[PDB]
Amino acid sequence: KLKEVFLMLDNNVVECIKEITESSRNGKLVFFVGAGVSTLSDYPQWWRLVDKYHEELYGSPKKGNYSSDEYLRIPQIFYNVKGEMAFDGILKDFFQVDKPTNPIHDKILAMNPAHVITTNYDNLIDTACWKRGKYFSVISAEEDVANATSSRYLLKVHGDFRKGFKGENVVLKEDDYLNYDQNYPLISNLMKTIIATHTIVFIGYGLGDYNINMLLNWVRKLQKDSFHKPFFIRTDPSPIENETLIYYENKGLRIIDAASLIDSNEYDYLERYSAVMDLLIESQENKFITKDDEVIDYIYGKISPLFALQYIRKIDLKHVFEYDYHFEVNGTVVRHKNKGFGYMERFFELKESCDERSKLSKKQYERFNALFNFFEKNGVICMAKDAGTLNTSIEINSLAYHGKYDVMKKFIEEQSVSIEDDYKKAFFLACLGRWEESYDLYSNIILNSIDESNGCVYYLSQINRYRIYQSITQAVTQFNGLGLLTFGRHYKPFTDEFLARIEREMTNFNIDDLFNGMPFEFQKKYKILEFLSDNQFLYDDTVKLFELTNKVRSEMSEGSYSFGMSSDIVVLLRLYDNLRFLYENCLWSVSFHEFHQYIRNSMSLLIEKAEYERTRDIDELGFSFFGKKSGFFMEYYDFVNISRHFKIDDIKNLERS
Amino acid sequence: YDYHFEVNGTVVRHKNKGFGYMERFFELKESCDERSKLSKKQYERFNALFNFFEKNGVICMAKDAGTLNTSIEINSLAYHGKYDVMKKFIEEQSVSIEDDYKKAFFLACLGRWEESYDLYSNIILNSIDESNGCVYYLSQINRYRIYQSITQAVTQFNGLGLLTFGRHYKPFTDEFLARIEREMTNFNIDDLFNGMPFEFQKKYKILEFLSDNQFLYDDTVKLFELTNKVRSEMSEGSYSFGMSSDIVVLLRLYDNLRFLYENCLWSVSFHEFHQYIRNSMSLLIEKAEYERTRDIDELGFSFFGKKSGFFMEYYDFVNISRHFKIDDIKNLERSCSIDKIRFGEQEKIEEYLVGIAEEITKQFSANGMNVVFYTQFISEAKAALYFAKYVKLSEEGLGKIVKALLFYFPERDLDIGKRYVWLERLTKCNELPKSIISIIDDFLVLQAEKHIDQNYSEVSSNGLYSRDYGALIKHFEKNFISKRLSEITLCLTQDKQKQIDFLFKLLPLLSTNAKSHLLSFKSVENINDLMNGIRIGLIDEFTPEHEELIIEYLETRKVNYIVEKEKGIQTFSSNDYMSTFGIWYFLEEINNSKMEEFIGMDDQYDFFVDPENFDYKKFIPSWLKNYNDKLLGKIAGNKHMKHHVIEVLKERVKNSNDKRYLEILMNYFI
Amino acid sequence: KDTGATHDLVYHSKINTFVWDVEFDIVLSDSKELNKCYFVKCFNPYRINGKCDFAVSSIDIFSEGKRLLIENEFNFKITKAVHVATSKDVTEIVLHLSERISSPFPIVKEVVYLD
């Protein structure tokens, strides 16, 4: 059945489900719960109470049929004539009962809503939340709005019975409906604000009810086409007519009709509620990738924000796609934890054959070209099954890396034209030795980045400015305590006023919360940058290196030799990846001591393994012709690494060993 | 960040602009009169503060410090494996939600995971209404972790358990695996903290890290300080004030361990913590060894000649047993001179090893078996029994350990050869007494009874069988007769060919009449039978007829070799029977001299019969890679063959730079 | 010579042996026939033994998926070797190495370093 439901959906139902699921993911979803959901679990409807009121008022019982106004008028007359005690006595007689919850409440809570608005006065949703374990603040009165323990609300607009079974805590008669806006200012304000800043789904109400029309009038008068249309989940025995559908769609609503998806009998209300509530929504929390043009759209949506940066580490990509695939350092993708359509495989197939590329429509070939260029530049080749002869190459384009000091001098002298040039100038100044100008330039960049942008340069400039401030403070501490002896003179690189200014400015900044304060779009698009503010971006590399070291040393101790490929190549590949990523994005992190230590240890291991493998050609070709040829030799990058990241004693130790 | 706390146990000022409240508190602590000055409720609050700080170990300012001591005490049944006490504490009736939290941790520890899940759910249900935020948060965390462990166990079992266990196991039903999968639907741990009251978010910020995917990422990166080489040549001890990185790293490790085990958190069983402990311990031991070697190099040998820079205790033993596999332990054993580090508090380690043995006996003697508990328990037992080589044991405890290892350890994880290796490792430090000898004799007798069945056959992964047990028995006691095996042999009959062969490997343990009866059943009639008996049958002496048969073979092979010279063709060869005879002659085993005429066939035979006249340009250095200790000592003994082999070994080690050749040339010969 | 089946070959120097995942068919004494056999070696320098024993390494023979016990002379003449990938280059590579190395049983399946 469910597959049939997934199939016959029109475009409208698919789009509605897409939006609902996406807004649930972002953490902004709200449910407007009705009365049918509270009748699925048996609970005395209002018409029974109206019938009892009619029986008690006139000796005769209910006659004919009741119009809309009778429900609100008869209780009013009963209260006016007999007295308050009878009203609340009947209320207590009819409402004092415990009833079980129903699967719809569990499904609704499983949808993970932010807030939950309801017109019910029963405690069914309270028990549902408590059993599921969620924590919501209950707001059923006026004094409750001020003192709220948390920041997610269970808003019962019409009241409850948590302070007694009195008829004053609730809204049940025409007088209560007349003075609502004057007796519930704060609750109404809060409900309107929630509606105007969230995504709303109406469940178990039925078109033409009082509250739907009142809200629709408010929406009409109080807005200027500057809000999001709510959604409506209609569950009634017969399919909705087209005239009513268009009339209500034009009035600011989006309707999902249960009877249209599946067919069922008259009284099987649970069936049609469940057909649409979750069995279609949560189950559709996955993608909808089914075409040769949806794949490119999805991949472009995922990869585009990384165009602002220059180079991306291969391992980091595992987080961009949410553990759906494994990316090796060599450049081969592998499937892992992905159950839907394989989109990387289809992308690679498109890359292989030009005819399939020709099938892509207009406006989507350019996106494919951009993605192809991105992946080719980074170094991702193909899947692991069809792997070819992978090669090893090294290329770093940053002038800072090669130590061309006159060139950076000239560039700093030259005028700039874009904020990127100023960014690079600040980094060059940092690697040139002008702490003052680097900090001032970074502050100016932070100021000038107010204009529309991605927020990338702003974030990285904040990080770099804080790092430079820490460097300045450390230098000041070292200079006046030890510099007095190193040179024999009190070297004063900094003026006191500048030190006081920077210390005053940076005294409140907290690098820990820098990421969490950014707009949610930035937090969902550039998540791989969260690791840049801590030591967390050197964790997996160090763990892998510590394990590989033990493996290789055990192999050397055994004396064994393998005739395949070196077991340490991942170390070299990761080392080059980290160097490239840090240097070619203009990040000060290259000056930290921990990075120096990481590089030192990697290089030590590689040199030791190379020396061990060298001498085997006498105990290998001296017993049998069979042997190996592959080896390791020093190069330009090896020389610059061993110059920058080693002390003299480390080199002496390597020379001795 | 007003102040900087230290594992040292002292505090320091840091970027504080205001009154020094902590210094004033310490001043109040020092003097009783000032504590008298305060009011009454303030006095009670001061007493609470004093209790807290003393319990957690904050002493005084850095300037007012001294020779502060340090010791680690983890108060938790789970870290000591007091299984019976845990079960009893589970069986009693609870009194508060805290005891239920402890009970759930113990239930999860003991392997019964479904009860843990149910208990955690009930605790979560009650705590929210009870208005106890901390236990609510921690119970949500632990229930999610238990669910993850259950799911991973289910997947691993349905993947490989049916193969490795030999039968598909169903530790959990399907109704439970459907229920929990339905409840934990779309549940994310990343918003658990943000959904709590802001009072909780203010008071309990320090616990936010418990909701993150991975913690201990700064601690792992900080381990790079143990790999510095500059320190030995020149070290400042910049880590804190005059504390080498060793102390800081060890105390940080103890802090993490104590915080996780004491507060009853379930993250202690996951891969990240085990890996962290492995890395820390390995790096500490390696650094200690390197410092020792460098100090030996700089100064004289007598200085720190056998000094142990690192000292083990009960805590290090338990950590290494729990978190290391066998491969990790062997890596540490082949990386540093672990034999040179002394162990302390041996009574507690002795009391730890006996508890493991009793638990093994309880687990496997009884029919009932908690598979999930048996898979998270066997690793620690194996590792502890392997690492127990370095500690001295008492007689009764050694007997308990040996009985548990030999009779009750499951064969699926400790086959006969691994059994032998584990048993033999224990005798290095402790000389074998009579009691353990009796136990191993009982094991041998039981195996002999096992061999009655025709299908029964010993399976070993390293080629070690009951013969090795008998040899170990005889090594420490030259004279010994097994009475039960003797009477078993006396009732022996011809048709029990499998028993015949089995106890042919245990001849030295039999009695005179028993061995006479047994040898009455078999004899040797050809060279093949001779070497079959020598290999399996233990033909100690070459009888004269055996020598004549050998000479007959040698003359026949001389004729065949002449006909081969005529042929000029040799298809292939498998085993050089001549080499064994030549080596035996060199070992003063064959006293005849006729074979000296039969010379010039095999270069090895010539080398082993007339070394003086043998042509040494034909010598193959690889020949030295098969001889054992006694043969190499004998070769060193002879004079005609010492310096030539010195020369060839020297040349090979120069060119090849091999380690085995250097070992032989250094330990033996020169 | 070049083949994709050689990437798992391992050389062990402490005993001068080659470890490889391969199955053998053997004609013994030109009268016995066996298929799907292999060896396992165990390097042991310290073993309690008598004067008859002089070898650090002890070997064991497995046939099919079962242990095999042979008392007669073990005259060895290889006839076919198969590797998981089933490439037949192993059939000549095995002969090449066996001729190259002098020690007996040049290629085995597993090695156990007891010390």
Q: What is the 3-state secondary structure (H, E, C) of A358-420?
A: HHCCCCCHHHHHHHHHHHHHHCCCEECCCCCCCCCCCCCCCHHHHCCHHHHHHHHHCCCCCHH
Question: Chains with 3 or more CB pairs closer than 8 angstroms to A?
Answer: B, C
Checking B417-423 for CB contacts under 8 A at 24+ apart, the result is B417/B460, B417/B461, B417/B462, B417/B463, B417/B464, B417/B465, B418/B461, B418/B462, B420/B464, B420/B468, B420/B469, B420/B472, B421/B462, B421/B464, B421/C114, B422/B385, B422/B386, B423/B472
Q: Which two tokens stand for residue B656?
A: 């090849």
Cα B507 to chain centroid distance, Å, stands at: 34
Q: What CA–CA distance (Å, rounded) separates A379 from A233?
A: 48
Q: Which two tokens stand for residue B599?
A: 């010379």
Closest by Cα among B130, B128, B135 to A150 = B128
Q: Do the Cβ atoms of C97 and A624 come closer than 8 Å?
A: yes
Number of neighbouring beta carbons within 10 Å of residue C99:
11
Q: With H, G, I as helix, E, B as strand and everything else as coil, classify residue B582.
A: helix
Question: Chains with 3 or more CB pairs closer than 8 angstroms to C?
Answer: A, B
Closest by Cα among A225, A154, A222 to A191 = A154
Q: What CA–CA distance (Å, rounded) separates B34 from B559?
A: 111
DSSP run (H or E) holding B125: helix B113-130
Q: Do the Cβ atoms of B387 and B321 come closer than 8 Å?
A: yes
Closest by Cα among C51, C40, C61 to B535 = C51
Residues of A with CB under 8 A from a CB of B: 27, 110-112, 130-131, 133-135, 149-152, 282, 285, 507, 534-536, 538-539, 542-543, 546, 550, 553-554, 557, 559, 594, 597-598, 601, 615, 618-619, 622-623, 647, 649-650, 653
Chain C residues with CB-CB distance to B625 below 8 A: 14-16, 103
Residue for token digits 């208990």? B119
CB-CB under 8 Å, A543 with B275: yes
Q: Do the Cβ atoms of B626 and C56 come closer than 8 Å?
A: yes
Q: Which two tokens stand for residue A232?
A: 């409506």
Q: Which two tokens stand for residue A552?
A: 């290789």
Q: Do the Cβ atoms of B120 and B100 come closer than 8 Å?
A: no
Q: What CA–CA distance (Å, rounded) separates A454 from B386?
A: 58
Q: What CA–CA distance (Å, rounded) separates B597 from B94?
A: 92
Checking B200-206 for CB contacts under 8 A at 24+ apart, the result is B200/B133, B200/B137, B204/B133, B204/B134, B204/B137
| CA-to-CA dists, residue C111 to B368, B497, C102, C104, C108, angstroms | 37, 32, 18, 14, 8
Q: What CA–CA distance (Å, rounded) separates A302 from A322?
A: 11
Q: What CA–CA distance (Å, rounded) separates B480 from B510?
A: 8
Q: What CA–CA distance (Å, rounded) separates B365 from A225?
A: 78
| CA-to-CA dists, residue B601 to A598, B470, B551, B570, B644, angstroms | 61, 39, 14, 13, 22
Chain A residues with CB-CB distance to C11 below 8 A: 560-563, 620
Provide the β-strand partners of residue C67. Answer: C62
Torsion angle of the four alpha carbons A639, A643, A647, A650, in this order, in degrees rounded to the nearest 10: 0
Q: Which two tokens stand for residue B506?
A: 């245990």
Please give the single-letter amino acid code of residue A12. Answer: N
Interface size B-C, in CB pairs within 8 Å, comes to 75
Q: Do the Cβ atoms of B430 and B466 come closer than 8 Å?
A: no
Q: Do the Cβ atoms of A218 and A192 come closer than 8 Å?
A: yes
Closest by Cα among A209, A240, A235 to A68 = A209
B327 at interface of C, judged by CB pairs closer than 8 A: no
Could you tell me which residues come within 8 angstroms of residue C105 by beta carbon, excluding any fewer than 6 positions away?
Answer: C17, C39, C41, C59
Secondary-structure breakdown of chain A: helix, strand, coil percentages, each rounded to the nearest 5: 55, 5, 40
Provide the β-strand partners of residue C60. Answer: C40
Residue A536, sorted as left (phi over 0), alpha (psi -120 to 50) or beta, turns out to be alpha
B514 backbone dihedrals φ, ψ, rounded to 5°: -65, -45
Q: What CA–CA distance (Å, rounded) separates A124 from A34?
A: 12
| CA-to-CA dists, residue B54 to B29, B48, B179, B204, B328, angstroms | 11, 10, 46, 21, 38
Q: Do the Cβ atoms of B285 and B44 come closer than 8 Å?
A: no
Could you tell me which residues come within 8 angstroms of residue B308 by beta carbon, excluding any fewer than 6 positions away?
Answer: B288, B292, B340, B341, B342
Angle at the Cα of B324 from the Cα atoms of B321 and B328, rounded to 5 degrees: 130
Angle at the Cα of A413 from the Cα atoms of A411 and A416, rounded to 5 degrees: 70
DSSP code at position B238 = T
Q: What CA–CA distance (Å, rounded) separates A604 from A595?
A: 14
Could you tell me which residues come within 8 angstroms of residue A337 by beta carbon, excluding any fewer than 6 positions away?
Answer: A323, A324
A314, exposed or middle or buried, with CB in 10 Å at 0-12, 13-18, 19+? buried
Could you tell me which residues come within 8 angstroms of residue B33 by beta carbon, excluding any fewer than 6 positions away?
Answer: none
Closest by Cα among C102, B648, B627, C22 to A624 = C102
Do strands A153-156 and A115-118 pair parallel, antiparallel, or not at all (unpaired)? parallel
Chain A residues with CB-CB distance to B663 below 8 A: none
Residue for token digits 């002298």? A413
Q: With H, G, I as helix, E, B as strand and everything else as coil, classify residue A608.
A: helix
Q: Which two tokens stand for residue B637?
A: 């003994």
Q: What CA–CA distance (Å, rounded) separates B552 from B490?
A: 37
DSSP run (H or E) holding A174: helix A174-178
C63 at interface of B, judged by CB pairs closer than 8 A: no
**Maximum distance among all Cα pairs of chain C, rounded to whole angstroms:** 46
Query: Which residues of A are annotated as catalytic?
Result: 121-122, 158
Nearest chain C alpha carbon to B579: C54
Q: What CA–CA distance (Å, rounded) separates B392 from B427?
A: 10
DSSP code at position B408 = I
| CA-to-CA dists, residue B89 to A616, B83, B85, angstroms | 61, 10, 6
CB-CB under 8 Å, B279 with A622: no
Please give the single-letter amino acid code of residue B193. Answer: F
Q: With H, G, I as helix, E, B as strand and everything else as coil, classify residue C17.
A: strand
C37 backbone dihedrals φ, ψ, rounded to 5°: -120, 165
Q: With H, G, I as helix, E, B as strand and everything else as coil, classify residue A13.
A: helix
Q: What CA–CA distance (Å, rounded) separates A652 from B232?
A: 13
Do strands A382-383 and A332-335 pair parallel, antiparallel, or not at all (unpaired)? parallel
Q: Which two tokens stand for residue B269?
A: 């069983």
Q: With H, G, I as helix, E, B as strand and everything else as coil, classify residue A173.
A: coil
Q: Do the Cβ atoms of C42 and C57 come closer than 8 Å?
A: yes
CB-CB under 8 Å, C74 with B622: no
Q: Do the Cβ atoms of A114 and A101 come closer than 8 Å?
A: no
Q: What CA–CA distance (Å, rounded) separates A159 from B220?
A: 55
Q: What CA–CA distance (Å, rounded) separates B513 from B8?
A: 72
Could you tell me which residues come within 8 angstroms of residue C53 by beta carbon, excluding any fewer than 6 positions away?
Answer: B628, C47
Residue for token digits 């207590």? A92
Could you tell me which residues come within 8 angstroms of residue B642 by beta carbon, excluding any fewer than 6 positions away?
Answer: B635, B636, B669
B72 backbone dihedrals φ, ψ, rounded to 5°: -115, 130
Q: What CA–CA distance (Å, rounded) separates A550 from B332?
A: 9
Provide the β-strand partners of residue C108. Answer: C19
Best mutation target, C3, C6, C10, C11, to test chain A (most A CBs within 10 A): C11
Closest by Cα among C53, C74, C49 to B528 = C74
Q: What is the resolution of this structure in A?
A: 3.5
Could you tell me which residues come within 8 angstroms of residue B364 by beta carbon, excluding any fewer than 6 positions away?
Answer: B408, B409, B410
A431, exposed or middle or buried, with CB in 10 Å at 0-12, 13-18, 19+? buried
Q: Do the Cβ atoms of A361 and A293 come closer than 8 Å?
A: yes
DSSP of A114-147: SEEEE---SSHHHHHHHHHT---EEE-SSTTTTS
The beta-carbon neighbor of C11 closest among A560, A565, A625 is A560
Q: What CA–CA distance (Å, rounded) separates B61 from B51?
A: 18
Q: What CA–CA distance (Å, rounded) separates C85 from A34?
A: 66
Q: Do the Cβ atoms of A460 and A310 come closer than 8 Å?
A: no
Please give the single-letter amino acid code of residue A626. Answer: F
Closest by Cα among B636, B618, B639, B614 to B627 = B636
Closest by Cα among C114, C115, C105 to C19 = C105
Q: Give the total residue count for chain A.
A: 657
DSSP run (H or E) holding A240: none
Q: What CA–CA distance (Å, rounded) separates A583 from A576?
A: 11
Chain C residues with CB-CB distance to A626 below 8 A: 96-97, 100
Q: Name the structure determination technique.
A: cryo-EM
CA torsion sign for A324, A329, A334, A337 is: negative
Cα A94 to chain centroid distance, Å, stands at: 47
Provide the β-strand partners of residue C41. Answer: C59, C111
Q: Do the Cβ atoms of A261 and A246 come closer than 8 Å?
A: no
Q: What CA–CA distance (Å, rounded) separates A156 from B639?
A: 105
The beta-carbon neighbor of B128 closest among A130, A594, A647 is A130
